[PDB]
Amino acid sequence: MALSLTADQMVSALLDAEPPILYSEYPFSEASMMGLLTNLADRELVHMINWAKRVPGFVDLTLHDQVHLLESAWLEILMIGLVWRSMEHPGKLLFAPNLLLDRNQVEGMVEIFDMLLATSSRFRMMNLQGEEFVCLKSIILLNSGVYTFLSLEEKDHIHRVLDKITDTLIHLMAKAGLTLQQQHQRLAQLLLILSHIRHMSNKGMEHLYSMVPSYDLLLEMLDAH
Amino acid sequence: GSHMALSLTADQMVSALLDAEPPILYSEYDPTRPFSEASMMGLLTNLADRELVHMINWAKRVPGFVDLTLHDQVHLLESAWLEILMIGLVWRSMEHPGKLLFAPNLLLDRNQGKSGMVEIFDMLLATSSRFRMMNLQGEEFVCLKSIILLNSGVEEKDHIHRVLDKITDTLIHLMAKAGLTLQQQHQRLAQLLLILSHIRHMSNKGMEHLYSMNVVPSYDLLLEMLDAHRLHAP
Numbered sequence A: 001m002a003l004s005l006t007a008d009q010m011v012s013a014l015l016d017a018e019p020p021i022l023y024s025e026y027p028f029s030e031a032s033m034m035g036l037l038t039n040l041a042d043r044e045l046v047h048m049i050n051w052a053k054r055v056p057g058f059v060d061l062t063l064h065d066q067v068h069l070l071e072s073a074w075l076e077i078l079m080i081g082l083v084w085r086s087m088e089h090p091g092k093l094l095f096a097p098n099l100l101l102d103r104n105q106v107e108g109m110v111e112i113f114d115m116l117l118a119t120s121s122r123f124r125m126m127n128l129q130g131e132e133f134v135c136l137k138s139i140i141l142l143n144s145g146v147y148t149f150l151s152l153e154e155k156d157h158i159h160r161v162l163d164k165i166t167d168t169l170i171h172l173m174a175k176a177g178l179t180l181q182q183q184h185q186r187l188a189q190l191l192l193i194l195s196h197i198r199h200m201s202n203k204g205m206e207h208l209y210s211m212v213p214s215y216d217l218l219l220e221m222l223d224a225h
Numbered sequence B: 001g002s003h004m005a006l007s008l009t010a011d012q013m014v015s016a017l018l019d020a021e022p023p024i025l026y027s028e029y030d031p032t033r034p035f036s037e038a039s040m041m042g043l044l045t046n047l048a049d050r051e052l053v054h055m056i057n058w059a060k061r062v063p064g065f066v067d068l069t070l071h072d073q074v075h076l077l078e079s080a081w082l083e084i085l086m087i088g089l090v091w092r093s094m095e096h097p098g099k100l101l102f103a104p105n106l107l108l109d110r111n112q113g114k115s116g117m118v119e120i121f122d123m124l125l126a127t128s129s130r131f132r133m134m135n136l137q138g139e140e141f142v143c144l145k146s147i148i149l150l151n152s153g154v155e156e157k158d159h160i161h162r163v164l165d166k167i168t169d170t171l172i173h174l175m176a177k178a179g180l181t182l183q184q185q186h187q188r189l190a191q192l193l194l195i196l197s198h199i200r201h202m203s204n205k206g207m208e209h210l211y212s213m214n215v216v217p218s219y220d221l222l223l224e225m226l227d228a229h230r231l232h233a234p
């Protein structure tokens, strides 16, 4: 079914799969801010599983492969969502409508906050569209753990979906009135930002390991369907 | 005369990048001595240090890089040096399934990596295998290596963006001349750029390994290397 969707049907399915914007628990300390962020991330993860299951082609994968992809991508997925919703707030990170944090607001957190702010500002300068954002978030889910699977026809399937999402991005750009040349330049600029999201996630994982959703929780959440 | 980076045709970009290529270096060990007395970590460290000197010369020849201030050139090299070494390795290991061709006299398998290095070797092998399956071309490789240098880490900003746009145009030109349809051109471009996020990942895991053990090039050493280049013979 996934591979038969037109570029317009792909966009519609991705937009419809979008998770809701959650609120933080109703001045802060390092301890209170860290607690609020941890709590928010845990609640967003449950919605992220529902979203992942609705990304065309994701449920065609085995439970083990779905878990591997989520284990590799969950923090990148949270981070891209954050940078998207913080676009219209220069110098601030919109974690939630009731949790808009500046750079000044924990050891090791400042470098991560600065990188997220710079990423949000880069997407704002590129005028990233909602339809492009859902494509990029789906690419992160299918790509981040693709080159790290232990053991062939299934890997080809993920790549086919990734090619379908690229086609979808191009279609969006052609409908927005970009010339063929502008289309490949914009495609490249967006995909290069995914290397920075990977980087930020790696720095974030380092921070968490120095104080992490296990394969077991992810499997139970995916199985709970 | 001197070409400004943004004025280069796709053929002139390919030619400048191919001409800027560093040489393939050899590992520095006596072939008359048993491999048991060599130290794999020592050989890799020595090779990387020698490759880093050639990398400085290469970076200075990447169109648009010398248009940046010394401070900005250092920042880009500090963030990208390991990804640059890694992409070079995965390119030259393409024709050796299951092995990493560090040098013509240093072809290492997964078992030799078992002697935190095993996870990094496995990721490099998967990247090399993916580039082999995609039939990555020499001309595409030089473009990707230059993109890594300019896109590294996390108006002068517009210039980098425009030089990156020029390199993308160059990649597309190479793909169009190879006979790919506009759609196949976009798909191949996306597949190559998505591998770059995995190369970033491998470099982050590599840096973590180095920080866990003067083994990481400091901002100061790189600044000195770029500045010392001014004193080299032309």
Ligand SMILES: COc1cc(NC2CN(CCCF)C2)ccc1[C@@H]1c2ccc3n[nH]cc3c2C[C@@H](C)N1CC1(F)CC1
Binding pocket: A034, A035, A037, A038, A040, A041, A042, A044, A075, A078, A079, A081, A082, A095, A112, A200, A201, A203, A204, A205, A207, A208, A212, A213, A214, A217
């Ligand atoms: C202290 O901050 C965080 C803590 C966690 N740890 C939790 C998830 N883990 C799961 C355990 C049971 F499964 C425990 C996760 C994320 C964050 C926040 C966070 C929080 C909510 C976000 N929404 N959108 C983006 C969000 C982000 C992104 C960055 C700013 N950050 C992550 C990081 F880089 C430091 C590791």
Ligand SMILES: COc1cc(NC2CN(CCCF)C2)ccc1[C@@H]1c2ccc3n[nH]cc3c2C[C@@H](C)N1CC1(F)CC1
Binding pocket: B041, B042, B044, B045, B046, B047, B048, B049, B051, B082, B085, B086, B088, B089, B102, B120, B205, B206, B207, B209, B210, B214, B215, B216, B217, B218, B221
């Ligand atoms: C022990 O292995 C390495 C050691 C170093 N440290 C050195 C550079 N530093 C400079 C001192 C001050 F400037 C000391 C650098 C690289 C490597 C090798 C290495 C080596 C030569 C390579 N050529 N092409 C790719 C190469 C690679 C890629 C991976 C396998 N890497 C391992 C890694 F990720 C942990 C760092």
